[PDB]
Amino acid sequence: EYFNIHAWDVWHDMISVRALTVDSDVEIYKVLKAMSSAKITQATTGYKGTQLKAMFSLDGPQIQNVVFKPKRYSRNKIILGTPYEGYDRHNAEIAAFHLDRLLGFYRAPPVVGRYINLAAEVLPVAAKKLATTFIKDKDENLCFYGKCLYCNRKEPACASNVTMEGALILWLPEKWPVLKLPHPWRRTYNKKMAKWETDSHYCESVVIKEPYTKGPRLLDLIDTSIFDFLIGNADRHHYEYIENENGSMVIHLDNAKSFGNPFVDEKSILSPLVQCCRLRSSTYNRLKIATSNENSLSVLLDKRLSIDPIYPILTSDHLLALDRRLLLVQDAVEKCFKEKNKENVIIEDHL
Amino acid sequence: EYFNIHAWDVWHDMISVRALTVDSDVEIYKVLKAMSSAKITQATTGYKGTQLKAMFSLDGPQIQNVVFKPKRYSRNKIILGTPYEGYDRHNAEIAAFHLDRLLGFYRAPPVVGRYINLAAEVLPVAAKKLATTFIKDKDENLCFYGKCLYCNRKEPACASNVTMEGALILWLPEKWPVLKLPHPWRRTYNKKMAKWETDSHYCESVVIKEPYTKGPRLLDLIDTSIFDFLIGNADRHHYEYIENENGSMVIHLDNAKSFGNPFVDEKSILSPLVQCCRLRSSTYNRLKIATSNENSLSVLLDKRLSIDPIYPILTSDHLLALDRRLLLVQDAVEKCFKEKNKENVIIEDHL
Ligand SMILES: *[C@@H]1O[C@H](CO)[C@@H](O)[C@H](O)[C@H]1NC(C)=O
Ligand SMILES: *[C@@H]1O[C@H](CO)[C@@H](O)[C@H](O)[C@H]1NC(C)=O
Ligand SMILES: *[C@@H]1O[C@H](CO)[C@@H](O)[C@H](O)[C@H]1NC(C)=O
Ligand SMILES: *[C@@H]1O[C@H](CO)[C@@H](O)[C@H](O)[C@H]1NC(C)=O
């Protein structure tokens, strides 16, 4: 046969240091379709971390690994309490991935929803580490509770009979190693307050040490703080970035502790933008196109979400919260304009 | 089923007024693969034109028409006579299309090689106009001779038994009508000499009438004269262009009267560049990258031709003629710099 390109090669070749994904729907739909239908050849789970998940190896000329995040809540679950509470939301990863493309960031790895038949697809290729955590619930649904720091028998992820809904997230290829640093605006995760909550010229302190003095890092974190605020992710306490000879970029990896509460907008997430009053020019241009379109951000987002196999992805309240929070980002940007003047707020760094 | 895009929609959506094709191999291979395998639902031929060809309707949700150019020569045929002598070369269309992408022009419609079973695929859907020109040759191969101006029974295109090799070229969609004008540097097609062969300030005369006074038309013809010079196409006496509200572009349509002789370089093809000494900046930049790559233009071109079903497409002598002619282009440009200074020859028109 002729003119064949395999989806896993499409994924490996589309990454550059300033873009994980591309505008082409043909290329992305090609990758999502393969993630959606590829045979699972191995399945396991790990001891590190606090969240229950699995790792699937998908078939192909070369094997492609994905993270599998199971459904843990109904679509109408409300996550209150602490801004960080609870299990990762599989539908939030899907929504965040498409919103990252819609806003032109292109910094999130592909995510697809999928209904996994645990009996037919997982058990016949499961590692012992995963298989030994399968149990049944009170209604004889098939479940597993995994291994991880907080994983235990009383908190399983349960299928509906044997069919488990979840999200698949592509591994980045080995050519693109990921580095992790603490976020200057991370929270304390106790009762004390962080420095940025008490200090208000805190950005002046950040820009003094590297890597925030020169280069794209601080504008990336401001981009990502806008993205995290719109989805309600208050828990990027450590950020991750790729890097080569041509630069670096903070990536939107693991966005699942989001879309937990459609009734509150956590403006503290916007602290990098509000305190620094710097904004990358290309980001600003796309934000004003988004507010001046005749279709709101959420109308455009749900059109993209309607292609995913497990759609509906978000309830209408989260969609309207997006549009409300986009206006709040515009307001924060304008306040930076008032108090430092536009031509000192908008930075054209050609990214 | 999920994430489906049909190839004919990929073709219709990728065209803009300054690019018929795109850099994405995924999108282009998707279209080429469909051309390679699509069922032929209709076949005909016309009275207009000078060259024997057919028109095929390919199946799909919508019908997609292609021009079919049959093989007429061996790969190693040396075509002597006038610079424009002979039949259309089917393999030249394939090579010219991939070179158009390799050089970054993106002005050529997709072309694929294909082996056509005339008995099974063409005859049962052939219109009478085409069917009545089918004959057998002295070795009982199935052939057809068409109804064009020079088409006649003594000059048929013949298959091997019933399998006919040829090239398929996509029609532009109806949304992109093509307009034709005489080329200011066209030949006389007699033994008289054309005005540009006698005068040496001829370009000065061209730029005074429209559409050569302003806009992209003249730099397009200089681009296309470089492209035609590399492939040996001395027969673009009329050029064709697309146009809408955002501009216009001369397209590389019908490139088959090329690669006729790998040992002769007809420098008269470069007359628009040599006489005008203007060169679009982006074209110059890509030409300089092509000469400084560690892999020659012909090595990179043959790697792309190796995916086509009827490969080998060009003999190594035509591949090396490409590299030879690229240096001759550089010489002509450097001569323009010496006699008008570089910054009056390189025009940055942002195209
Ligand atoms: C679901 O459970 C029923 C029994 O209620 C069984 O008949 C059926 O085969 C199960 N379906 C799957 C996909 O396991
Ligand atoms: C960095 O950019 C240059 C220029 O586009 C490119 O040639 C090079 O391959 C890039 N770096 C890597 C590691 O690919
Ligand atoms: C193909 O053509 C040859 C003539 O060269 C003929 O003898 C033969 O029977 C044909 N065979 C098939 C399988 O079409
Ligand atoms: C380019 O022209 C097309 C119509 O030919 C139009 O739809 C489009 O809006 C134009 N581009 C821009 C950026 O306005």
Residue numbers in the entry:
A (entry chain B), B (entry chain A): 65 to 415
Paper text:
The Fam20 proteins are recently identified kinases that regulate essential cellular processes by phosphorylating proteins and proteoglycans.
In contrast, the single Fam20 proteins in basal animals such as sponge (Amphimedon queenslandica, aqFam20) and hydra (Hydra magnipapillata, hmFam20) are apparently Fam20B-like because they exhibit robust activity for the Galβ1-4Xylβ1 disaccharide (Gal-Xyl hereafter), and do not phosphorylate protein substrates such as OPN, casein, and enamelin. Although human Fam20B can be purified to homogeneity, it failed to crystallize despite extensive trials. hmFam20 crystallized readily, but the initial crystals diffracted poorly. Treatment of the purified hmFam20 with endoglycosidase F3 to remove the majority of the N-linked glycans significantly improved crystal quality and diffraction. The overall structure of hmFam20 resembles that of Fam20C, and can be superimposed onto ceFam20 with a root-mean-square deviation of 1.5 Å over 342 aligned Cα atoms. There are four disulfide bonds in hmFam20 (Cys207-Cys222, Cys212-Cys215, Cys267-Cys340, Cys341-Cys400), which all align with the four disulfide bonds in Fam20C. The hmFam20 structure enabled us to consider how Fam20C may have emerged in higher animals. Inspection of the hmFam20 structure (Fam20B-like) and the ceFam20 structure (Fam20C-like) reveals three regions in Fam20C that lead to a change in substrate preference.
